[PDB]
């Protein structure tokens, strides 16, 4: 779509179907190039949605279009959503923990009134970050502290609340749950990686 669209395929409503959810990174290219605030905005808000385990440079870019639009909130937004699938293959949430660190001092930097969903997001991700943080720092010696954690974030988005509004995302829920189970208490289990593989596929 883009391709062609660069290859004069017009503009303002080339994106605005272009939203969705997905995993997909060049929104930002065409936002960039495109110069349209209302592009930068869905573009930005956008990759809240995405669910990956890599390129934690979307951290300083959206900071960089939310610089150009003055609203931390979804700033603070994907800093909590890429610091939790970030550290799906990262294997350290010190890092991560900055981030939401960084999501509070944004939203305290944030003046809109969507900083309180922010903050409605932050209540339930940071209450884990801080066992969280247990199941990372000591994913290689207690199992059972990451293990619990997952099984109560696992156990949070079946209620009412959406997966913003019960903890952090299952970016990592699912990743850390596999990585116990090879890595602590038995890392000499080779049966236990064609779990993981399974549990992966």
């Given at each position: 779509a883009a391709k062609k669209y660069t290859?004069?395929?017009?503009?303002?409503?080339?994106?605005?179907?272009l939203l969705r959810g997905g995993d997909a990174?060049?929104?930002?290219?065409?936002?960039?190039?495109?110069?349209?605030k209302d592009i930068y905005l869905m573009a930005?808000?956008?990759?809240?949605?995405?669910?990956?385990?890599?390129?934690?440079?979307?951290?300083?870019?959206?900071?960089?279009?939310?610089?150009?639009a003055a609203a931390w909130e979804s700033l603070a937004s994907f800093y909590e959503a890429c610091a939790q699938i970030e550290v799906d293959e990262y294997r350290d949430y010190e890092k991560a923990l900055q981030a939401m660190r960084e999501a509070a001092k944004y939203v305290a930097k944030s003046k809109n009134d969507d900083r309180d969903a922010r903050v409605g997001v932050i209540n339930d991700r940071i209450a884990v970050a801080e066992q969280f943080v247990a199941a990372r720092q000591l994913i290689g010696s207690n199992p059972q502290e990451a293990l619990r954690v997952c099984d109560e974030l696992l156990r949070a988005i079946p209620p009412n609340s959406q997966d913003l509004e019960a903890g952090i995302r299952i970016g990592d829920v699912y990743a850390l749950m596999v990585?116990?189970?090879?890595?602590?208490?038995?890392?000499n289990e080779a049966y236990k990686a064609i779990e993981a593989m399974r549990r992966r596929g």
């Open positions: 290859q004069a395929g017009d503009k303002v409503k080339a994106m605005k179907a990174e060049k929104i930002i290219f065409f936002a960039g190039v495109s110069r349209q930005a808000n956008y990759l809240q949605t995405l669910n990956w385990h890599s390129d934690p440079e979307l951290m300083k870019h959206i900071i960089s279009f939310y610089t150009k990585e116990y189970w090879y890595e602590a208490r038995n890392p």
